[PDB]
Amino acid sequence: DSFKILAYLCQKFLDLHKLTLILNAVSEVELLNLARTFKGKVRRSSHGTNICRIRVPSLGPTFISEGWAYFKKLDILMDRNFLLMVKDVIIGRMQTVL
Amino acid sequence: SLFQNSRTIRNSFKKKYHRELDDLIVRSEVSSLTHLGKLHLRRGSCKMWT
Amino acid sequence: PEIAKFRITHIDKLVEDPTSLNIAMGMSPANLLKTEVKKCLIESRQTIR
Amino acid sequence: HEFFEKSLIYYNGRPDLMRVHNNTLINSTSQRVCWQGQEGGLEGLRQKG
Amino acid sequence: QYNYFGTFARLLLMMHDPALRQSLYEVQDKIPGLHSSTFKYAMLYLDPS
Amino acid sequence: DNLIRKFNSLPIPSMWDSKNWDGVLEMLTSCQANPISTSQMHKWMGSWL
Amino acid sequence: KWHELPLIKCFEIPDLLDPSIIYSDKSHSMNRSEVLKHVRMNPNTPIPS
């Protein structure tokens, strides 16, 4: 009964961690490797900016670019600090319950 | 023994010295991990001390 | 562990961190950054006011 | 407090609101992000005294 | 709990190492010693001394 | 807030209009975006958690 | 009345030759003149530290 909730929290933690690793990349090779490892798709915009699409379970589809993240099914725009706050909340809860 | 941040080092010095920093961060990593791998081969060829 | 043949550039370690060894492994990130900062200070030692 | 009473407090996120006036800053948006001089302390300073 | 959270962090890192800019599972010819038990003991109980 | 406004037909201060957000706006145009005004985000994570 | 006495020095300030007694890796402000200069010239960027 506790392991189920821990599993959900860990799913969310992993989703947020993958997103954070994506928006903190500093090169095209790292972004492409993350897309290949986490089943993403890197498109190239017109102004020389790379966008990354990724579908995670807990949040849905997600579009990332220049430190910004947009969730469609949630209809949310998010910067880095808010994502990191949510990740820290999840980490705290999961570690505490573990 | 005070320069720990990279920003304070990057702005306090020239530009090319930035490129001899990022690779540093990578090199130690490989130099660490291979060591932790090499331990597995020399497993049954080391003696015990009293 | 394995140990590297002694050279003159290692005594600094024994002066920085005593109770230590001279192992053939790589050098930690902290010491590498320290050496790079030392080189930067040694090179630009005239522009400093 | 001779230094606090003679110093200029300003928030360095919003210079859009402040304007220069005779070697000091004044607000132009009715938000009070900066002011000149005060008789109170700030965090981390003279805690020991 | 040190052991538990240590293998936790080890798996989270093997997922992706930001310093190497790629995963650790996707390298077996440059750092070929991973996926071994001795690595798992050294990453968690081998003092840096 | 200011990026949501710029994506819409609303104006913003000049501090945020002097940035390189053209790519993010191109991305949000290619997805039919509709954000939630920044007051409901905490309310969202109150449910998503 | 002990404060009205003619007190004199009883403590010797140390010799601050080495850093790490005063200086550390932190951020501080800049002189008022350069602040006002940045506000006039660059009113659409946050005042750096």
Swiss-Prot record, chain D:
Tell me the compartments it is located in. Virion; Host cytoplasm
Which positions, given as ranges, span the membrane? Answer: none
User: What is the role of the protein in this entry?
Assistant: Multifunctional enzyme responsible for RNA synthesis (replicase and transcriptase), cap addition, and cap methylation. Also performs the polyadenylation of subgenomic mRNAs by a stuttering mechanism at a slipery stop site present at the end of viral genes. The template is composed of the viral RNA tightly encapsidated by the nucleoprotein (N). L is packaged into virions during assembly and translocates to the 3' leader promoter to initiate transcription after entering the host cells.
As for family, the record states: Belongs to the rhabdoviridae protein L family.
Entry domain remark = The RNA-dependent RNA polymerase (RdRp) domain is responsible for the RNA sythesis. The polyribonucleotidyl transferase (PRNTase) domain is responsible for the initiation of transcription at the 3'-end of the genome (priming) and pre-mRNA 5'-capping during start-stop transcription. The methyltransferase (MTase) domain is responsible for the cap methylation.
Q: How is the subunit organization of this protein annotated in UniProt?
A: May form homodimer. Interacts with the P protein; the association of P and L forms the polymerase complex, positions it on the template and allows to package the L polymerase in the virion, since P acts as a bridge between N and L. L binds loosely to N and is further bridged by the P protein, which interacts with L and N oligomers simultaneously.
This chain belongs to which protein, by name? RNA-directed RNA polymerase L
Tell me the organism's taxonomic lineage. Answer: Viruses, Riboviria, Orthornavirae, Negarnaviricota, Haploviricotina
The primary gene name is L
Q: Which residues of the full protein are shown?
A: 639 to 687 of 2109
